Amino acid sequence: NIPLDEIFEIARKMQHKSFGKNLASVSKEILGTAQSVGCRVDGKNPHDIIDAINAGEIDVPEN
Amino acid sequence: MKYIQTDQILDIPEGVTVDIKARVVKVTGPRGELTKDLKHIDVTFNKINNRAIKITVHNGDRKHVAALRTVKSLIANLITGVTKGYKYKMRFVYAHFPINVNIIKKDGQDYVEIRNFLGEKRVREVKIHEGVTMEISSTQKDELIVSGNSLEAVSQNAADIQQICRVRNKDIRKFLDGIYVSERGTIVEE
Amino acid sequence: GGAREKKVQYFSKLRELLEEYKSIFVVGVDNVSSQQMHEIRKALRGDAVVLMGKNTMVRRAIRGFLSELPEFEKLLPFIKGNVGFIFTNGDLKSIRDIVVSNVVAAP
Amino acid sequence: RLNEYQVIGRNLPTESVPEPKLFRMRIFAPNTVVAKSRYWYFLQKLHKVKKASGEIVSVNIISEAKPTKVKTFGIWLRYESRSGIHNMYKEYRDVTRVGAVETMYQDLAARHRARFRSIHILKVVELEKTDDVKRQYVKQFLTKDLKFPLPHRVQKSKKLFQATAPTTFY
Amino acid sequence: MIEPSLKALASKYNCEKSICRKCYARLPPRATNCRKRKCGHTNQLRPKKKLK
RNA sequence: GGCCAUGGAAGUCGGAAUCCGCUAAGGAGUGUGUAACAACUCACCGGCCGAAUGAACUAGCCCUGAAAAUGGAUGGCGCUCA
Ligand SMILES: [Mg+2]
Ligand SMILES: [Mg+2]
Ligand SMILES: [Mg+2]
Ligand SMILES: [Mg+2]
Ligand SMILES: [Mg+2]
Ligand SMILES: [Mg+2]
Ligand SMILES: [Mg+2]
Ligand SMILES: [Mg+2]
Ligand SMILES: [Mg+2]
Ligand SMILES: [Mg+2]
Ligand SMILES: [Zn+2]
Numbered sequence: 001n002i003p004l005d006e007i008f009e010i011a012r013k014m015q016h017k018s019f020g021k022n023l024a025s026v027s028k029e030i031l032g033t034a035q036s037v038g039c040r041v042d043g044k045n046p047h048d049i050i051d052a053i054n055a056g057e058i059d060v061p062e063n
Numbered sequence: 064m065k066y067i068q069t070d071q072i073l074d075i076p077e078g079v080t081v082d083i084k085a086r087v088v089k090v091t092g093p094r095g096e097l098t099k100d101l102k103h104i105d106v107t108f109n110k111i112n113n114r115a116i117k118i119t120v121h122n123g124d125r126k127h128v129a130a131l132r133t134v135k136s137l138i139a140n141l142i143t144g145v146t147k148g149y150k151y152k153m154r155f156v157y158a159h160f161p162i163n164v165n166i167i168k169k170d171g172q173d174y175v176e177i178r179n180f181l182g183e184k185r186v187r188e189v190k191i192h193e194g195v196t197m198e199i200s201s202t203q204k205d206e207l208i209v210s211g212n213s214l215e216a217v218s219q220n221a222a223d224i225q226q227i228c229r230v231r232n233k234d235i236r237k238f239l240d241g242i243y244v245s246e247r248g249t250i251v252e253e
Numbered sequence: 254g255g256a257r258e259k260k261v262q263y264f265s266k267l268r269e270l271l272e273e274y275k276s277i278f279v280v281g282v283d284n285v286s287s288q289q290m291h292e293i294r295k296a297l298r299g300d301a302v303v304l305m306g307k308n309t310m311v312r313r314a315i316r317g318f319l320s321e322l323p324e325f326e327k328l329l330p331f332i333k334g335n336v337g338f339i340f341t342n343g344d345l346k347s348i349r350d351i352v353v354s355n356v357v358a359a360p
Numbered sequence: 361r362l363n364e365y366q367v368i369g370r371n372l373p374t375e376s377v378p379e380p381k382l383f384r385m386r387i388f389a390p391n392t393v394v395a396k397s398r399y400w401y402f403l404q405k406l407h408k409v410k411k412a413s414g415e416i417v418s419v420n421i422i423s424e425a426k427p428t429k430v431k432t433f434g435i436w437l438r439y440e441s442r443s444g445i446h447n448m449y450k451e452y453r454d455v456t457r458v459g460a461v462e463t464m465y466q467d468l469a470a471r472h473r474a475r476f477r478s479i480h481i482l483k484v485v486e487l488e489k490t491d492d493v494k495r496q497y498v499k500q501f502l503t504k505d506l507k508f509p510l511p512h513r514v515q516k517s518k519k520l521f522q523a524t525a526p527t528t529f530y
Numbered sequence: 531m532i533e534p535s536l537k538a539l540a541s542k543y544n545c546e547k548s549i550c551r552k553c554y555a556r557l558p559p560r561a562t563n564c565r566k567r568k569c570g571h572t573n574q575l576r577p578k579k580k581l582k
Numbered sequence: 583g584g585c586c587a588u589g590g591a592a593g594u595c596g597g598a599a600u601c602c603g604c605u606a607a608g609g610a611g612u613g614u615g616u617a618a619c620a621a622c623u624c625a626c627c628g629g630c631c632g633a634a635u636g637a638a639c640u641a642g643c644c645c646u647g648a649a650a651a652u653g654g655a656u657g658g659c660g661c662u663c664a
Contacts, residue, residue, distance in 0.1 A: 018603045019295045025603055032602025036610075037585055047601055054602090067500045067508055105511075121508055156540045158532050225543075236581045239532060239540035263606080283629090291604060306606050307628060335629055337606095441641060472642055514663095534615075541614095552646090570646030 001040040024060055069128045071135040073116040079142055081116060083108045088138055092145030095212055104130055144212040148250030151221045155205035157240045166197050175224055181240050189224050192216040210250055264314045270302055274342040281336050292355045301341035362388050364422040364458050365395040371409050388461045392419050424456040432498055433460040436482035439474045451495040457484055547578040
């Protein structure tokens with residue numbers, strides 16, 4: 001369903017993409033674009049679990 | 064509402080001498096003189112200085128106030144006609160039949176002669192207004208240059224040429240043939 | 254009512270970055286694309302902050318606040334036309350190496 | 361041709377109420393017969409009183425305070441049209457309060473076909489400040505150093521025939 | 531055949547128009563009302579349809 | 583070159599979608615253009631001038647709505663700050 005603690009890898013293997021703020025913004029770019037498909041993103045659809053850590057849910061301030 | 068007073072300011076460049084007497088405007092510039100009668104409008108004129116003229120309407124209603132900036136624009140067009148000239152460029156638009164355009168002179172009059180328009184055997188003739196110069200562009204293929212001091216005559220001759228080439232009994236979205244005004248500018252480039 | 258709040262956030266973050274670093278010079282651009290601007294801030298993650306906005310808001314929002322941070326005053330008549338801001342503190346050479354690097358021209 | 365009247369009246373005293381409250385209205389009427397008539401028209405729109413159960417106490421003309429001082433008046437109106445009932449506010453230039461109301465009656469007759477019977481005057485106020493003037497058709501006469509000519513003068517002749525060419529200078 | 535540069539010039543006069551829905555008038559594309567008195571200067575306009 | 587449809591559709595054929603990231607600026611796009619991109623134009627934000635501007639509604643006169651048969655009737659002439 002992913003992350004599978006690897007959605008950061010999809011962001012750091014696509015490290016040359018979003019010219020964001022500090023790495024974690026790149027993780028949000030895949031968040032927005034993978035919402036368009038629509039599968040098992042932790043149960044529902046994105047633009048929801050995105051907006052959790054977009055405001056602040058668990059913890060991804062990865063360095 | 065009968066606005067108590069409405070004003071517009073003409074601007075006269077350095078080499079131009081506007082001359083107004085009893086609503087008959089005579090504008091003189093390096094390129095010549097143009098005259099226009101405005102006796103059909105109720106306006107008054109004040110010479111502010113040699114480079115500016117105030118144009119005033121007193122106690123005018125909505126339409127009579129509306130007629131003030133048009134007076135301003137006409138005199139400004141006269142000024143730029145006698146200080147810069149006018150130039151309209153026309154492009155010949157045809158899909159199949161080439162338009163054969165000549166500048167002929169019959170009975171002492173200049174004419175624009177259009178032949179083979181949409182294959183017709185008819186010969187179209189458009190009278191060239193006085194003060195208007197026609198030229199077939201050498202630098203451009205299928206281009207006619209209409210030039211002169213008076214914007215009204217130049218644009219009306221250009222419109223005559225465009226209008227005589229209207230398409231009948233066809234889908235004019237498909238049959239786009241004709242002679243169309245492509246550029247409206249001045250003789251002196253700016 | 255939403256415009257005056259984005260205006261307030263604009264002044265809030267205008268003054269948040271004013272005291273965090275310091276002095277700034279002339280910074281004018283023109284015919285600069287959206288992709289053109291993303292390149293400078295891509296290599297300037299942390300050593301600089303690319304402040305942006307417009308002109309008329311910036312001039313007055315500081316001119317009236319010349320009480321908590323006066324000093325400028327006569328420094329405002331410099332703001333003309335298409336001008337941005339790069340908020341940092343380095344040296345007259347150390348920033349022009351990392352900023353002037355990308356240029357796009359035309360015939 | 362109108363005058364401004366102060367009309368004061370009251371309910372007839374009863375043994376229950378021997379001094380009912382006195383109510384005053386400022387009435388713009390051509391004469392004192394209509395001033396007391398209009399008074400009862402408005403009291404019955406507001407107070408449980410009638411002409412049969414009431415009494416007119418005083419009718420007095422209110423003259424202009426400065427009849428040779430040029431003023432701008434704002435008039436608040438409530439008039440009836442063919443379809444509904446409307447509130448309106450308009451402004452007039454005149455030297456007397458009465459003369460502004462006379463212009464008002466002519467003005468709503470011409471642009472809204474509102475007859476005298478269709479109009480209620482809510483309030484007439486003299487506008488002290490130039491910032492109090494909201495309407496542009498009277499604000500244009502408050503500009504500094506106002507000058508304007510009167511072009512195209514038509515002279516009224518006593519005779520049918522004139523031996524010289526007509527002119528319109530002035 | 532007409533070159534695309536000339537086809538836009540011709541289309542400016544033949545195609546880029548609005549049409550009155552009641553009396554069939556060729557109006558400027560930006561027009562909000564019809565200029566003809568016969569229809570009452572109606573605001574019921576629609577773009578001139580294109581070939582397809 | 584978003585996903586799926588599609589011979590192809592990359593914003594501008596068609597369906598779930600309508601998000602994110604930088605922004606001050608930008609829609610999974612308002613158009614023209616391509617077999618398709620490209621291309622330009624917009625949506626909004628900039629620089630410029632600098633004092634006003636937009637929308638909805640109400641009701642006066644006028645206009646559209648408003649087609650019949652002998653030629654013709656605000657009584658006629660005629661009248662347009664009447
Ligand atoms: Mg046919
Ligand atoms: Mg009551
Ligand atoms: Mg008035
Ligand atoms: Mg009046
Ligand atoms: Mg009534
Ligand atoms: Mg006489
Ligand atoms: Mg009409
Ligand atoms: Mg009618
Ligand atoms: Mg008649
Ligand atoms: Mg009379
Ligand atoms: Zn129409």
